[PDB]
A and B are shown apart, each in its own frame.
Chain A
Amino acid sequence: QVQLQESGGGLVQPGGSLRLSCAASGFTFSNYKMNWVRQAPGKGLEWVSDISQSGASISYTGSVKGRFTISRDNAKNTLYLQMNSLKPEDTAVYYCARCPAPFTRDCFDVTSTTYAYRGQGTQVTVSS
């Protein structure tokens, strides 16, 4: 199936360095764009990042822009996110995502707990 592996995740103090990945299963990841999201305890999920088809038009959340970084990997077919300079506000349950179709340039994917292609989800606790 389209199962996405929440690579990495664990306790880390604010200001730290983190790196988590998403693993392909059954789809042509190169053809296939993607995103990242998170979710807070008592709050809905929030769109964080993405990376476009070639790798060009990258963007991020205004809240923590620049602090973290998304990158793709055509060769190994996996989503690369390296998080540096951690903050106490990032402590939440983290989720991968995909943008449903390939051949696309957008995606309607935050739907509360009810999305298909959201991975298992990591509860990365970023705190001292």
Chain B
Amino acid sequence: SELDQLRQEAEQLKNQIRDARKACADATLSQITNNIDPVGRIQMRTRRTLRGHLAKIYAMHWGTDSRLLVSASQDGKLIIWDSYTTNKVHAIPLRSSWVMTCAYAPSGNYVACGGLDNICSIYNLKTREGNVRVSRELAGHTGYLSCCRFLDDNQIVTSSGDTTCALWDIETGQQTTTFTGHTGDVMSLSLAPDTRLFVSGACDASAKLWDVREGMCRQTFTGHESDINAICFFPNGNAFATGSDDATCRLFDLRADQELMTYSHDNIICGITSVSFSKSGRLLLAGYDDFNCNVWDALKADRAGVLAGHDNRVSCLGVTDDGMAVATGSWDSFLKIWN
């Protein structure tokens, strides 16, 4: 009835959108995309080997401190390692043990962990007495909390399989906004380096965009075949290379509102799981869903590097906040920092 016609009106709005995208669609600066000078070979190999985690690693996160990175494996722990010292610093038991993603703090005093528990449990380091204690457990979703991120030690935003993306506040331990825009699932997200904007990956590749204060959508970044896995904002804050399940590191651009040149050439096996740019702004890293990972220069589309010290899936990585290191997490209880 009128509902179908109204959806058709939505599709005609999409028609105007595709008109606008075509009208702003100009040729890429082919010199810089392909003809610019390359990056060259890399001899950076796994130095800090961290094999002390007792299950399949499901996440990790470099700290804004650039010192303490959490990791929430399958054995109900958040082993808060310390890359330079290579010594774990705060073991933590967890109510359940089927936890998906763990995010660390801006200051370096709160960590949060949420998996199939449905419950985002933010953890504390108030006193250095043993059996590190929970700051609080909070919930409200009805699904596995895919991934959360700290803006400020009171401002946690997360997103889960409810197709929703909530902005918890832990001053009262509740939400402030709910980003009810998605229709697939949610897998991961990254917040703008000025901690205002983000983009939400999903199952249906529609990496929507919002902002913390409002959370009102601007731009759906469609254009992936298989499925979006991981995202990270370009080191300035106007692009992000959402990885996928079809080995497509399609590096978008925020100002454009459009695609940018895709990073797909075969001899690469299924899927991506983790992406985050180095601080140079032209050395992308993307952990492919098969047993390994390869660099993808944003100026040449050449996989001029090898991340294959891993023999099973790599389910998250991240470049150091200052750009001094990047570290992946591989399923066979075996985490490494690459340098």
Tell whether any CB of A sits under 8 Å from a CB of B in the complex: yes
Binding site for B on A (CB under 8 A): 1-2, 26-28, 31-32, 100-104, 116-117
User: B76 within 8 Å of A by Cβ?
Assistant: no
CB-nearest residue of chain A relative to B271?
A101
Chain B binding site: helix, strand, loop or mixed by DSSP?
loop
Contact A103 B270 (CB under 8 A): yes
Chain A residues near B237: list those with CB within 8 A: none
Q: How many residues on chain B are close to A (CB under 8 Å)?
A: 16
Q: Which 8 A-B pairs have the closest CB atoms?
A: A116-B204, A27-B225, A103-B270, A101-B245, A1-B222, A116-B184, A101-B226, A116-B203
Contact A117/B204 with A28-B225, A100-B227, A101-B226 known, Cβ cut-off 8 Å: yes
Pick the contact of A26: B184, B204, B225, B270 (CB < 8 A): B225
Contact A100 B226 (CB under 8 A): yes
Contact A32 B269 (CB under 8 A): no
Chain A residues near B106: list those with CB within 8 A: none
Chain A binding site: helix, strand, loop or mixed by DSSP?
loop
Chain A residues near B75: list those with CB within 8 A: none
Contact B206 A101 (CB under 8 A): no
Chain B residues near A104: list those with CB within 8 A: 270
CB-nearest residue of chain B relative to A120?
B7
Taking the nearest CB of chain B, how far is it from the CB of A110, in angstroms? 15
Contact B225 A32 (CB under 8 A): yes
Taking the nearest CB of chain A, how far is it from the CB of B266, in angstroms? 9
Pick the contact of A102: B205, B223, B225 (CB < 8 A): B225
User: B183 within 8 Å of A by Cβ?
Assistant: yes
Chain A residues near B270: list those with CB within 8 A: 101-104
Interface-centre pick from B203, B204, B222, B226 (highest chain A CB count, 10 A): B226
CA distance A101 to B183 in the complex (A): 18
Taking the nearest CB of chain B, how far is it from the CB of A109, in angstroms? 11
Interface-centre pick from B184, B204, B225 (highest chain A CB count, 10 A): B225
CA distance A88 to B270 in the complex (A): 42
CA distance A100 to B225 in the complex (A): 9
Pick the contact of B246: A1, A101, A116, A117 (CB < 8 A): A101
Taking the nearest CB of chain B, how far is it from the CB of A95, in angstroms? 15
Taking the nearest CB of chain B, how far is it from the CB of A100, in angstroms? 6
Interface-centre pick from A31, A32, A100 (highest chain B CB count, 10 A): A100
Taking the nearest CB of chain A, how far is it from the CB of B284, in angstroms? 21
Contact B227 A101 (CB under 8 A): yes
CA distance A27 to B184 in the complex (A): 18
Chain B residues near A2: list those with CB within 8 A: 204-205, 225
CA distance A104 to B246 in the complex (A): 10
Chain A residues near B205: list those with CB within 8 A: 1-2, 116
Chain A residues near B203: list those with CB within 8 A: 100, 116
Taking the nearest CB of chain B, how far is it from the CB of A114, in angstroms? 8
CA distance A1 to B183 in the complex (A): 14
Chain A residues near B204: list those with CB within 8 A: 2, 116-117
Chain A residues near B183: list those with CB within 8 A: 116
A-B contact list, 19 entries, CB within 8 Å: A1-B205, A1-B223, A2-B205, A2-B225, A26-B223, A26-B225, A27-B225, A32-B225, A100-B227, A100-B245, A101-B245, A102-B225, A102-B246, A103-B269, A103-B270, A103-B271, A104-B270, A116-B183, A116-B203
Taking the nearest CB of chain B, how far is it from the CB of A120, in angstroms? 9
Chain A residues near B222: list those with CB within 8 A: 1
**With contacts A101-B227, A102-B225, A116-B183 known, what are 9 further pairs, Cβ within 8 A?**
A1-B205, A26-B223, A31-B246, A32-B225, A100-B227, A100-B245, A101-B226, A101-B246, A103-B269
Contact A102 B184 (CB under 8 A): no
Interface residues of B in 127-165 (CB under 8 A from A): none
> Residues 264-302 of chain B: 1 if any A CB is under 8 Å from the residue's CB, otherwise 0?
000001110000000000000000000000000000000
Taking the nearest CB of chain B, how far is it from the CB of A79, in angstroms? 15
CB-nearest residue of chain A relative to B204?
A116
CA distance A120 to B245 in the complex (A): 23
Chain B residues near A1: list those with CB within 8 A: 205-206, 222-223
CA distance A102 to B223 in the complex (A): 15
